[PDB]
Every structure is written in structure tokens, then in C-alpha cells.
Amino acid sequence: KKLMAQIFFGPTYYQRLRHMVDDKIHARARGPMQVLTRQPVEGRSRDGG
Amino acid sequence: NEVFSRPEWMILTCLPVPPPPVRPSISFNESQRGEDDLTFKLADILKANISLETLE
DNA sequence: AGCTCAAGTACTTTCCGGTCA
RNA sequence: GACCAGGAA
DNA sequence: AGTACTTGAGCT
């Protein structure tokens, strides 16, 4: 069925940005602990909390 | 406070030495120590103390 | 010499490349 | 691991 | 980043 509205529609230059989710996503439940503080380590990379 | 803090105790004659877990040697590989900043400062204190002790 | 101040001080967010024993 | 530096909702 | 207190030193 037709849309009751008309759409603004056309080309528009879009850019792919360096922030991608599978590089961001992170989860931890028990894992490497700092030595001094014995708390979880920092950073996705290091598998932190 | 006559029990928990007398003024005389604001002055140090006996220096409590914290144990490794406070100043742990972060030891990369095996043939390379990597001691903690405090372990050094104590080392200095120790040394400085021995110079004074023998000096007098 | 002391005593007043202006001019001096340190101190007040969650993520993700280099040099140092 | 300290430390410095740079860049993000 | 502007205000805090507190230190500091210089002048009459």
C-alpha cells in the first residue's frame, strides 16, 4: 500500500566511522586481577572489569 | 591521648617496614626484578641510616 | 622589628601510543 | 606495571 | 576554570 506521506528521498554522502560494535562489545565475570590492589584489571583488551 | 597517641610518637625512632604486598616487585620474565618505588625509597632510608650510624 | 597585606601557593569521566627498571 | 602524551558519547 | 585558604614577603 502507498504511504500516506511522501518521503524526502535522494543521495547523501555518508561516512563509515571507525567505531564498530564488535570492537567495542565486552563482558567479564571473573578474570585477571591487578597485582597491587587485587581488583579487576582495566581495559577490554586485557579482559578487564 | 595517653594510650593511643602521645605527642612523643609524632617523632620517629622506629620505622615500620611494610611487607611486599604493599610494595610488590612487578617481575617481567625471570632474570629481571623490577622492584616497587617504595622498595627503593626504603633502600635509600636504610642506606642513609647506615651512613649516619657508622658516622657517629 | 613587627606587622600589615598583596601576591604567592595547591585544589577542586565512563570508554578506547610512547619510555621506564 | 608505573609514568607521560594524544583522541572519543 | 575561578575560588578557596593559606602561605609568603615586603613596607612604614
Side-chain angles (χ1 to χ4, degrees):
Chain A
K1 194 171 166 199
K2 283 185 212 146
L3 286 197
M4 192 61 169
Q6 298 72 21
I7 318 301
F8 194 54
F9 195 83
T12 290
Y13 207 73
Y14 262 93
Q15 294 172 292
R16 172 152 214 230
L17 304 203
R18 287 158 41 251
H19 307 289
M20 293 155 302
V21 62
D22 278 339
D23 294 324
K24 243 92 169 299
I25 174 167
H26 172 36
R28 142 129 177 196
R30 284 193 282 99
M33 300 279 180
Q34 194 120 132
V35 197
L36 180 61
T37 68
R38 307 223 187 167
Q39 293 178 215
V41 309
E42 161 159 5
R44 181 181 127 130
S45 34
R46 273 158 271 172
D47 181 30
Chain B
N1 179 279
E2 86 152 11
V3 168
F4 288 154
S5 75
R6 293 176 148 264
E8 46 228 270
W9 298 341
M10 288 181 293
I11 294 167
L12 300 174
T13 32
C14 195
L15 195 50
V17 183
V22 186
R23 42 167 190 90
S25 56
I26 298 320
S27 29
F28 47 103
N29 65 83
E30 160 74 32
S31 306
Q32 291 157 25
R33 260 184 198 169
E35 287 288 342
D36 184 83
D37 257 351
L38 279 207
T39 312
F40 282 83
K41 205 30 149 197
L42 290 164
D44 288 340
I45 295 176
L46 226 284
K47 285 178 190 142
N49 194 72
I50 331 181
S51 94
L52 176 63
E53 195 238 323
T54 57
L55 261 190
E56 53 191 345

